[PDB]
């Protein structure tokens, strides 16, 4: 699928806001995912044991992961669709080391949208949410295609 430039602009304008606090937004997102869809936590051997939201917030390693994930995502969004080189390593580890089904990539997309909507209401009205949704769907479509070539199809 293809985003127009005005859609990419809506995406990169709210992302610029996220980028003022990457660690705080990575924390919010992962916790939202884990609270909404607890089964997802089972994929993380390093964080599997965290029992409450308070322990998740206090986890220094979970914060460092959140930074790593948002940074990789940010790098993809900034390519505005031309993200074939960035997607390759990401799809290989998520398909063959981590084994993350597309369904879980849908769950984290929903958590990203939930946190931007709560934190950036002024820069995340309906049009901007529509554009971010389209960018994450494009992401998911391209990753699923890569999964299939890799032998996983998730
Ligand atoms: C926006 C979508 C996502 C992005 C950009 C992303 C990015 C990354 C990156 C950059 C790393 C470290 C390098 C690597 O192992 O490839 C990582 C690790 C990992 N990811 Fe993802 N990921 C995403 C979605 C998810 C989801 C939905 C799951 C599970 C429900 C997941 C599970 C994991 C696990 C288990 C690891 C290893 C973490 C650790 O170091 O202990 N990922 N991810």
From Swiss-Prot:
Alphabetized InterPro entries for the sequence: Globin, Globin-like_sf, Myoglobin
E.C. numbers: 1.7.-.-, 1.11.1.-
Subcellular location: Cytoplasm, Sarcoplasm
Alphabetical keyword list: Cytoplasm, Heme, Iron, Metal-binding, Muscle protein, Oxidoreductase, Oxygen transport, Phosphoprotein, Transport
Keyword flag Heme: yes
Binding site for heme b: 94
Superkingdom classification of source: Eukaryota
Coiled-coil annotated spans: none
Residues that bear Phosphoserine: 4
Annotated O2 binding sites: 65
First-tier enzyme category under EC: oxidoreductase
Reactions accelerated catalytically: Fe(III)-heme b-[protein] + nitric oxide + H2O = Fe(II)-heme b-[protein] + nitrite + 2 H(+); H2O2 + AH2 = A + 2 H2O
One Gene Ontology cellular component annotation held by this UniProt entry: sarcoplasm
Positions of modified residues (Phosphothreonine): 68
Residue ranges annotated for the Globin domain, each copy included: 2-148
GO biological process: removal of superoxide radicals
A Pfam family the protein falls into: Globin
Gene3D superfamilies: 6.10.140.2100, 6.10.140.2110
Membership in a protein family: Belongs to the globin family.
Record note on quaternary structure: Monomeric.
Function comment: Monomeric heme protein which primary function is to store oxygen and facilitate its diffusion within muscle tissues. Reversibly binds oxygen through a pentacoordinated heme iron and enables its timely and efficient release as needed during periods of heightened demand. Depending on the oxidative conditions of tissues and cells, and in addition to its ability to bind oxygen, it also has a nitrite reductase activity whereby it regulates the production of bioactive nitric oxide.
Name of the molecule in the record: Myoglobin
Organism of provenance: Physeter macrocephalus
């Amino acid at each position: 699928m293809v985003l127009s430039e005005g859609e990419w602009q809506l995406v990169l304008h709210v992302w610029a806001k996220v980028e003022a606090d990457v660690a705080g937004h990575g924390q919010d997102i992962l916790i939202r995912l884990f609270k909404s869809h607890p089964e997802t936590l089972e994929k993380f051997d390093r964080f599997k044991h965290l029992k409450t939201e308070a322990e998740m917030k206090a986890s220094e390693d979970l914060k460092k992961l959140g930074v790593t994930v948002l940074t990789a995502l940010g790098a993809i969004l900034k390519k505005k669709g031309h993200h074939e080189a960035e997607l390759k390593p990401l799809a290989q580890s998520h398909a063959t080391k981590h084994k993350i089904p597309i369904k879980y990539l849908e769950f984290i997309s929903e958590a990203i949208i939930h946190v931007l909507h709560s934190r950036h209401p002024g820069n995340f009205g309906a049009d901007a949410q529509g554009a971010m949704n389209k960018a994450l769907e494009l992401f998911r479509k391209d990753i699923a295609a890569k999964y299939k070539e890799l032998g996983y199809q998730g």
